[PDB]
């Protein structure tokens, strides 16, 4: 039986996570949970799966102490904020640490999951968006075993080679590999014109959370995910083909020397690719509806247009750059976005905001999640003074 | 290097064979062909990889001879008829064998090179469907490796986990596979009514271009399958699929479906079977699905194309009832391009002869074959029966 770490329970990753573990209590055990948000889900959480250790921020551990008490919760260790998270992330006592905090708040703790030696699940892109060549280096240094839990990601896994994870890491695909298609939904905005495009709005460009919704309407979506694709995968990103695919039921692909193609289909349900990764190379029992081809009947394909798109191309650029380059682009990506919803700028100005950071601010290397981090605020405030001279 | 030996070498599955061994000639070298015709073919075939035995029928035997002679070829072994190619298939110097041989007259070079323990890459319906068992109990009693050339099968090998010929043989789907999804054209009827099948001609519609309108193509698939995966037809999902861009699935406990999809080119799935598990280069174009941009599927109607019940019934009953289906179905097409009897026809006279001939164990080669005999006759027989 293996003990289970998760960070950021109470999303839907952290529920989807627990579903899995809660039909096989024979093969899994829940040793620690975080969460920094929804509390008293958290202590429901608590006492069907009773963790040892329990992490909230600082800001929530009267309110956890205080249900804990109400509902005559004992025996579980507290503790707070980041020191907590990486107490639990690399504790003795776990052998899996579902890593599923988004943002800053958790390359921290993934980082030291990964030196810890764990399998540890990226169910976040943060984590190889911004610290990826150091997050590769550690499981490789410390031999961890880093297993991608997003959709597309682990499409491919399931789609490469069996003995993949033993390639050599080059940049060139391996073992008969000849090329990797990303697919891609191709967002709201698949069939808009040029001029159509200048004027969606926030409330067109969300139709799950607004920041994905928006990312998705972009394509800085895919582009997160392609060099994503590229640290995971050891692979420079001219082998990653970008393929828009508007049903989502085809979740990625690998094509091969001889001609082949492979393929992961499924149902939307993060509990397949979920528990792939938390039993791999095993497959594990879901509840997951098998796909059903007869109801969803068809499939179609098509180029995603990069001058309607450029954010795709931004995050290709940013790839071949390296170092700070897709920490500069992701932060500027957000600033751009949040400026958009809160509209002071328009939807195109988003890759524009994207793409003048990337040109104004020097790129350096990746070394630290200190110097990632320092480079991440500067180049917000780069976004934010672009926002500002633009209109915005 | 390996040295292979081509059962059927003249056919498509020999020439896209070729093309692929002539591009690694450092991998693998040709030892044996055999051919049935095109022996002006096999000449120029027997010049580029110097085969040291090439077999034919004893009729082909004193042309092919001339042609060497003529074409100034020596050093050749010329062996004739079935015992040339047992021994070619079953030969100590042969590493890998090409089944492309078809019909009842490829069971027994095929089965030979099985007992050999050879890797041999099946590409006849035949050694499955009338010799299922014989074959796959053959192959682990003398640890041979065989494997799937024909697409949908090979489509399915390369969707299932990387060990699975280590799996336990049951019957049941094995480690985390839950269904297979075997996919289908359909044919060229797929759409018609109950009504307008009844009045489809032969031009419209040689036995495998029939047999994949009547879905029997499909249904004998089915039967290799279940024998091959060691699986219940009841975890095979026929799946109608138009533009035959995807080549078959495997469905998997935790939700996933996986998929193989390419390019209609049988190169690749050859080359998948000649060096799995390593990936072997080929000239066939990746598949673009910019221009290939969509795909469908549907349920096959099992009431407009019975073939396909008529093919699980026949594995339910295992035994010689595979063999029965597959030689009442040749009688039958046969008669249909004759314009005998009607297209819905065809499935009446192999549902009646699986009805009116009794069923047993499919113990030997021997007994398969006298069944088939049996089959026919039974078949033709009801076939003038019914005006035919």
Sequence with gaps: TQSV??????????????????????????????????IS????????????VVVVPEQKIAELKTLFAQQNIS????????????DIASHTDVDIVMAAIVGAAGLLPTLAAVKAGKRVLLANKEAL???GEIMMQAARDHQALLLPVDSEHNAIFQSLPHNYLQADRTGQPQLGV????????????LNHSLEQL?????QQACKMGQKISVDSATLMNKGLELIEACHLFSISEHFVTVVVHPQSIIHSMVQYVDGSTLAQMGNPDMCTPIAHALAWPERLQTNVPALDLFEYSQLNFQAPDTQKFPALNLA????????????????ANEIAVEAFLMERIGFTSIPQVVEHTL????????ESIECILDKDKVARSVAQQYISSIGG
């Design 5 to 38: 770490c998760i960070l950021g329970v109470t999303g839907s990753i952290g529920r989807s996570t627990l579903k899995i573990l809660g039909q096989h209590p024979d093969k899994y055990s829940v040793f620690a949970v975080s969460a920094h948000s929804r």
């Design 75 to 86: 025996d579980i260790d507290v503790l707070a904020g980041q020191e907590g998270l990486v």
């Design 129 to 131: 968006v911004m610290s």
């Design 178 to 189: 000849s090329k990797i298609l990303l697919t891609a939904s191709g967002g709201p905005f």
């Design 359 to 366: 040109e104004k601010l020097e790129n350096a290397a990746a």
């Design 41 to 52: 889900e958290l202590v429901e959480i608590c006492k069907q799966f009773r963790p040892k």
């Design 316 to 331: 290709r650029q940013a790839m071949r750059a390296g170092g700070l380059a897709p920490t500069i682009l992701n932060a």
């Design 198 to 202: 200048v004027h969606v709005t926030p």
